[PDB]
Amino acid sequence: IPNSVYWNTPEPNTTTVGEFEYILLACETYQIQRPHNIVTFFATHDGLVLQNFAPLRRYQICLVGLTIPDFLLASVKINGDPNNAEDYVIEQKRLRDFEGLKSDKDVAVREALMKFSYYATIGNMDEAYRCVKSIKNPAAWQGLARLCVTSGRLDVAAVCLATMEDCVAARALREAKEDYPDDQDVQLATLALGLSMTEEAVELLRKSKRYDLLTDVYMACGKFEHAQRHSERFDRARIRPVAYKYAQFMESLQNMDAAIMWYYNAKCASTDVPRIFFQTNRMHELRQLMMGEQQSTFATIFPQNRELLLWWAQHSERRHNVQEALRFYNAGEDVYNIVRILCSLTPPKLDSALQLVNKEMDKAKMRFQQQQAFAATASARFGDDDHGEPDPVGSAYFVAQLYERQGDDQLALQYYQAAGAYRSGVRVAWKMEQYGVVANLAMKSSDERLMLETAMALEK
């Protein structure tokens, strides 16, 4: 509901005021301590074109006059007394599109800025571009760029950015154009972000989905505790980057507690929690954990983290502590490393290696037989010669190597085939003066080189 209307009153003894500057109308409105708004219109022949709204604060009591570029308000002091009748001081609130007015005698710039505001309200920004060329105040360029955001024109907006020498925002716009050429809404969002207006990025492509970019924006505003709770319910594909970014944020804050717990929460404790402990020279505490009320939280999770067990096993293995490595590998059930260690030791503990290799062959056979028997129901009527094979066990490789070092090459060939080492299989098969095993292993390799050379190997 309005209360009063006001035209732009020209200044006393100032007859050089522009024509369009005479036609701007300001209205004081309040919604149904009430909100206050001041709304601006251009009283054109075609009707009333709305320019902009302007909310007023609690101390801003009302509007008394308009004199461009200022609403003249008989307000009270922010810390003053509204009950006081004597605290009625005038405030010249700037027009929203009259920012950066360094000179109060700036006449041509003010007139061309008013013309630009009129043309922006009309909208067809092609000559609104020329409305500001006379102006060298960069605030006019910023307002033009905001208009370019609201409209959706970017070739003007690139010049709008690059004439203010905002090389950060121009770089962002160029990268958005280069990487996302099909989508223009993302480039508009990048431009809006470079213009220090941030609520628009979600509103741009809210439900048509761009959850990753708004997650990055939510992080970039320092609102981690908003981004993580947004992504937990709404964007499940990027919980780990939010946790990792918060962990890096805490590490740069020199708070190893939260940094370590969030590097745990990001499922990157295989490489990053040991990084922090090793680069803080806190390796004694890590050894203590691997082999205090707040330490309960750490010790609840740390000793049984399978990735941590595996990393500590590798660490002690390369620290020339073979037996502690074996202990931690068995605690982490990494079959391949255990078999490698056992086949590497002097003496090579061959029987336990064979037992673990055959246990994994047993599990692989179980999976292959389960899938084959599951598939054979429809293969009862459908005759299929699907010569599927169980997943070969890589850990068997070392075992064959042991027989490869013991002259039991006939035994080694079986484990090489069980490992999938077709090249090592034919390497073994050479010395038997055998060719059929060579040929069928080459076929089973299913790689062109393995028959491509064994062809003329057989021809000689």
Binding site for other proteins (CB under 8 A): 165, 167-169, 171-172, 174, 190, 193-194, 196, 198, 212, 216-217, 219-222, 237-238, 240-241, 244-245, 248-249, 252-254, 266, 268, 271-272, 274-275, 278-279, 283, 311, 314-315, 318, 336, 367, 370-371, 374-375, 388-389, 394-395, 397, 419-424, 444-449, 452-453, 456
Phi, psi angles (nearest 5°) of residue 2:
-85, 165
What is the sign, positive or negative, of the torsion defined by CA atoms of 361, 314, 312, 270?
negative
Nearer to other proteins by Cβ, of 291 and 452: the residue is 452
> Is the omega angle on the peptide bond into residue 347 within 30 degrees of 0, that is, cis?
yes
Nearer to other proteins by Cβ, of 10 and 390: the residue is 390
* Token pair of 87 as six digits: 């605290």
Q: Which helix (H) or strand (E) holds 43?
A: strand 36-44
Nearer to other proteins by Cβ, of 12 and 388: the residue is 388
Distance CA 68, CA 110 (A): 9
Phi, psi angles (nearest 5°) of residue 210:
-145, 45
CB of 249 to other proteins, least distance (A): 6
Nearer to other proteins by Cβ, of 169 and 353: the residue is 169
Nearer to other proteins by Cβ, of 43 and 253: the residue is 253
Closest CA to 396 of 423, 426, 416, 372: 416
Nearer to other proteins by Cβ, of 388 and 436: the residue is 388
Helix axes 409-419, 396-404, angle to 10 degrees: 160
Nearer to other proteins by Cβ, of 69 and 332: the residue is 332
Residue 101 · residue 110 · CB < 8 Å: yes
Nearer to other proteins by Cβ, of 112 and 158: the residue is 158
Residue 24 · residue 42 · CB < 8 Å: yes
CB of 219 to other proteins, least distance (A): 8
SS3 category, 40: strand
CB of 423 to other proteins, least distance (A): 5
* Token pair of 238 as six digits: 């990027």
CB of 452 to other proteins, least distance (A): 7
Residue 250 · residue 262 · CB < 8 Å: yes
CB of 85 to other proteins, least distance (A): 38
CB of 147 to other proteins, least distance (A): 19
> Radius of gyration over alpha carbons of the chain, in Å?
38
CB of 144 to other proteins, least distance (A): 18
Distance CA 164, CA 139 (A): 9
Distance CA 131, CA 447 (A): 69
Distance CA 445, CA 450 (A): 7
CB of 172 to other proteins, least distance (A): 6
Q: Which helix (H) or strand (E) holds 52?
A: strand 47-56
CB of 240 to other proteins, least distance (A): 6
CB of 447 to other proteins, least distance (A): 6
Nearer to other proteins by Cβ, of 80 and 138: the residue is 138
* Token pair of 441 as six digits: 């292993």
Residue 117 · residue 51 · CB < 8 Å: yes
Question: Hey, what amino acid is at 193?
Answer: L
List beta partners, residue 75.
89
Nearer to other proteins by Cβ, of 28 and 272: the residue is 272
